[PDB]
Design an enzyme around this catalytic site. Structure first.
Site, PDB file in Angstrom:
ATOM      1  N   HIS A  43       0.811  -1.211   0.000  1.00  0.00           N
ATOM      2  CA  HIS A  43       0.000   0.000   0.000  1.00  0.00           C
ATOM      3  C   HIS A  43       0.847   1.264   0.000  1.00  0.00           C
ATOM      4  CE1 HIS A  43       0.449   0.206   4.509  1.00  0.00           C
ATOM      5  NE2 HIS A  43       0.399   1.502   4.238  1.00  0.00           N
ATOM      6  N   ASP A  99      -0.041  -7.633   2.016  1.00  0.00           N
ATOM      7  CA  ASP A  99       0.420  -6.239   1.875  1.00  0.00           C
ATOM      8  C   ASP A  99       1.952  -6.213   1.857  1.00  0.00           C
ATOM      9  OD1 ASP A  99       0.507  -3.486   1.777  1.00  0.00           O
ATOM     10  OD2 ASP A  99      -0.228  -3.204   3.840  1.00  0.00           O
ATOM     11  N   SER A 198       3.904   3.093   7.867  1.00  0.00           N
ATOM     12  CA  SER A 198       3.648   2.110   6.817  1.00  0.00           C
ATOM     13  C   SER A 198       4.920   1.604   6.165  1.00  0.00           C
ATOM     14  CB  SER A 198       2.765   2.746   5.733  1.00  0.00           C
ATOM     15  OG  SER A 198       1.486   3.031   6.231  1.00  0.00           O
TER      16      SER A 198
HETATM   17  N1  LIG Z   1      -3.326   4.022  12.108  1.00  0.00           N
HETATM   18  C1  LIG Z   1      -2.370   3.199  11.613  1.00  0.00           C
HETATM   19  C2  LIG Z   1      -1.937   3.288  10.301  1.00  0.00           C
HETATM   20  C3  LIG Z   1      -1.001   2.369   9.836  1.00  0.00           C
HETATM   21  C4  LIG Z   1      -0.535   2.437   8.401  1.00  0.00           C
HETATM   22  N2  LIG Z   1      -1.498   1.876   7.463  1.00  0.00           N
HETATM   23  C5  LIG Z   1      -2.477   2.613   6.933  1.00  0.00           C
HETATM   24  O1  LIG Z   1      -2.636   3.809   7.185  1.00  0.00           O
HETATM   25  C6  LIG Z   1      -3.421   1.861   5.986  1.00  0.00           C
HETATM   26  C7  LIG Z   1      -3.250   2.316   4.527  1.00  0.00           C
HETATM   27  C8  LIG Z   1      -4.689   2.298   3.952  1.00  0.00           C
HETATM   28  C9  LIG Z   1      -5.535   2.723   5.105  1.00  0.00           C
HETATM   29  N3  LIG Z   1      -4.829   2.157   6.274  1.00  0.00           N
HETATM   30  C10 LIG Z   1      -5.301   1.924   7.507  1.00  0.00           C
HETATM   31  O2  LIG Z   1      -4.593   1.450   8.382  1.00  0.00           O
HETATM   32  C11 LIG Z   1      -6.746   2.285   7.820  1.00  0.00           C
HETATM   33  N4  LIG Z   1      -6.807   3.163   8.995  1.00  0.00           N
HETATM   34  C12 LIG Z   1      -7.617   1.027   8.052  1.00  0.00           C
HETATM   35  C13 LIG Z   1      -7.754   0.128   6.845  1.00  0.00           C
HETATM   36  C14 LIG Z   1      -7.312  -1.190   6.889  1.00  0.00           C
HETATM   37  C15 LIG Z   1      -7.432  -2.015   5.781  1.00  0.00           C
HETATM   38  C16 LIG Z   1      -8.006  -1.539   4.617  1.00  0.00           C
HETATM   39  C17 LIG Z   1      -8.458  -0.231   4.563  1.00  0.00           C
HETATM   40  C18 LIG Z   1      -8.335   0.595   5.668  1.00  0.00           C
HETATM   41  C19 LIG Z   1      -0.519   1.386  10.695  1.00  0.00           C
HETATM   42  C20 LIG Z   1      -0.995   1.354  12.001  1.00  0.00           C
HETATM   43  N5  LIG Z   1      -0.609   0.414  12.884  1.00  0.00           N
HETATM   44  N6  LIG Z   1      -1.900   2.250  12.452  1.00  0.00           N
END
Ligand SMILES: Nc1cc(CNC(=O)[C@@H]2CCCN2C(=O)[C@H](N)Cc2ccccc2)cc(N)n1
Ligand SMILES: *[C@@H]1O[C@H](CO)[C@@H](O)[C@H](O)[C@H]1NC(C)=O
Ligand code: NA
Ligand code: NA
Lengths: 250, 28, 11
Positions: A43, A99, A198
């Site tokens: 992602h 991922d 990420s």
């Molecule tokens: N907060 C946080 C953020 C991360 C980093 N990853 C993201 O930001 C991902 C990228 C796409 C959106 N996303 C989400 O994590 C969304 N909040 C929830 C989600 C999950 C699965 C599919 C769609 C959406 C890691 C941790 N540990 N925490």
């Protein structure tokens, strides 16, 4: 990283920053697994819901860094990408299943006191260490709280959580290509990854051979360091056969 | 690969970082 | 907010 601490110099010499050329900005974390190959979350490169679909020439990787924003002359090394490889069954539509992505560098990076690769787990190291309560370490330059960015790399140690607790913490569908980590509300201690972390590594130090192994990739969460919520990580060993196929094919 | 996971400023010098023992203590 | 990187890398 929420509720972590500043890294020590050379503490995470496999840490990689994914950097956008224009505008110049941080995109993601990543990890060095050889002199030519970098591991990250899919992602970080491809997420159509946010109109994200990067190509090689959009990106740089910066290796050996500590400071988030400074150009670390004579320490960091900046590399261009030859090719991006995303898992063919990466599920960006639903839950970020599988991922994982690889990036091949145009030229090998020179190792140094600050630049050195992490190991990928074998089946037995994974079976022995991926157990509830066992702690790993997460590193990144992402946000320090949910709603605020750090001067230097941040580090937090977190326990792996029992799979039923992970499943019961969220409405998103969990798969065997994921695990979750973090403290429970009754445990007192805190910490989590957050946006901007990420693609960085979740590592464990094997007590059998005293080597660091990358067991996970920072994948997703809901909020940051919320009570009763946990961070979710790509299960690197579960996808290692794909990793190996790509590196052998290319 | 042969030298993976051994940090120049820690394992290669037999120096420990300040929190790696927390990981070892959890591997029960 | 990022210190400029050498132009060599952006070519
Ligand atoms: N907060 C946080 C953020 C991360 C980093 N990853 C993201 O930001 C991902 C990228 C796409 C959106 N996303 C989400 O994590 C969304 N909040 C929830 C989600 C999950 C699965 C599919 C769609 C959406 C890691 C941790 N540990 N925490
Ligand atoms: C992403 O972009 C590449 C080239 O820009 C294209 O071939 C591919 O189909 C795109 N994927 C999605 C899901 O948009
Ligand atoms: Na659930
Ligand atoms: Na939490």
């Amino acid at each position: 990283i929420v509720e972590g601490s500043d890294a020590e110099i050379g503490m995470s010499p496999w840490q990689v920053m994914l950097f956008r050329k224009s505008p110049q900005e941080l995109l993601c974390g990543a990890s060095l697994i050889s002199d030519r190959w970098v591991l990250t979350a899919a992602h970080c490169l491809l997420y159509p819901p946010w109109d994200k679909n990067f190509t090689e020439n959009d990106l740089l990787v910066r290796i050996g860094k500590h400071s988030r924003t400074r150009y670390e002359r004579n320490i960091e090394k900046i590399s261009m990408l030859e090719k991006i490889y995303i898992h063919p069954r990466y599920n960006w539509r639903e839950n970020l299943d599988r991922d994982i992505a690889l990036m091949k560098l145009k030229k090998p990076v020179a190792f140094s006191d600050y630049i050195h690769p992490v190991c990928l787990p074998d089946r037995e190291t994974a079976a022995s260490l991926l157990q509830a309560g066992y702690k790993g370490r997460v590193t990144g330059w992402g946000n320090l709280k949910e709603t605020g960015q750090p001067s230097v790399l941040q580090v937090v140690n977190l326990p792996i959580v029992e799979r039923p607790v992970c499943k019961d913490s969220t409405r998103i569908r969990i798969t065997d290509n994921m695990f979750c980590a973090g403290y429970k509300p009754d445990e007192g201690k805190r910490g989590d990854a957050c946006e901007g972390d990420s693609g960085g590594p979740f590592v464990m130090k094997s007590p059998f051979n005293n080597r660091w192994y990358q067991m996970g990739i920072v994948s997703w969460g809901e909020g940051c360091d919320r009570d009763g919520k946990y961070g979710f990580y790509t299960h690197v060993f579960r996808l290692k056969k794909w990793i190996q196929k790509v590196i052998d094919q290319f | 690969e042969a030298d993976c996971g051994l940090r120049p400023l820690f394992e290669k010098k037999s120096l420990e970082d300040k929190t790696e023992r927390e990981l070892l203590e959890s591997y029960i | 907010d990022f210190e400029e990187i050498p132009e060599e890398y952006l070519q």
